[PDB]
Amino acid sequence: VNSFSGYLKLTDNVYIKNADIVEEAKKVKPTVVVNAANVYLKHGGGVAGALNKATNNAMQVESDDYIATNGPLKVGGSCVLSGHNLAKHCLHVVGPNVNKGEDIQLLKSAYENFNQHEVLLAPLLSAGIFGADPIHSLRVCVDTVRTNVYLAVFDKNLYDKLVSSFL
Ligand SMILES: Cc1c(Cl)cc(S(=O)(=O)NNC(=O)c2ccccc2O)cc1Cl
Structure with missing residues (x-):
């Protein structure tokens, strides 16, 4: 039992909410x-x-120190940093950005990072300003993530579309 509330159950381990x-x-x-x-x-x-x-920009300050030490992430990769006032940890995951021409096949690799954590609150990777189809992103999520994922979808119209088209 966990503290997430009001989610629709999509599969055994994936839950979605507006x-x-x-x-x-x-x-x-x-x-x-x-x-x-x-x-x-x-x-x-x-x-x-x-x-x-x-x-309050503390995530950015921490992130700039991380990059200064380690260099950039890979598309499809991730790093664990502080969750600040929002969570214990933040898993920074890089999905491919379609508005940059990056290979959408890397979306599966990006979602594989979720499997290192038993439970996560997450957005749909590569959605929004990253340019990918959120319906496709949801399909890759369901077919890749095996741990318990709670997907928050900001846009109510998109949330409704995501549920009604789910196979
Ligand atoms: C960068 C980013 C990611 Cl990666 C994921 C999401 S989301 O999971 O909340 N889905 N939402 C959408 O795709 C969307 C599309 C068109 C208009 C409004 C929308 O909200 C939002 C964002 Cl801005």
Whole structure:
């Protein structure tokens, strides 16, 4: 039993809801919140911009030190950093950005990072400003992630579309 509330059960381990991931994280304080990161951990917009704003820019400060030490992530890769006031940990995961021309096949590799964590609050990877079809992202999520994933979808119209088309 965990503290997530109001989710629709899509599969054995995947749950989906219309929610602002920032507000969901602040309320649930999950062990792991997933950020829709880029390879530079520059949290300017989209989900990353919103998560970073909620930490009063502390996520960005921590991230800049991480990059200065380690260099950029790989597309499809991840790193674990602090969750600040939102979660115990933040798993920064880089899905391919379609508005950059990156290979959508890397979306499966990106979701594989979720399997290192028993329970996660997460957005759909590569959705939104990353340019991929959120329906496809959901399919890859369900077919790749084996741990318990709670997907927060900000847009109510998109949430409704995501449920009604799910196979
Ligand atoms: C960067 C990013 C990611 Cl990676 C994931 C999500 S989401 O999982 O909340 N889905 N939402 C959408 O695709 C969307 C599309 C068109 C208009 C509004 C939308 O909200 C949002 C964002 Cl901005």
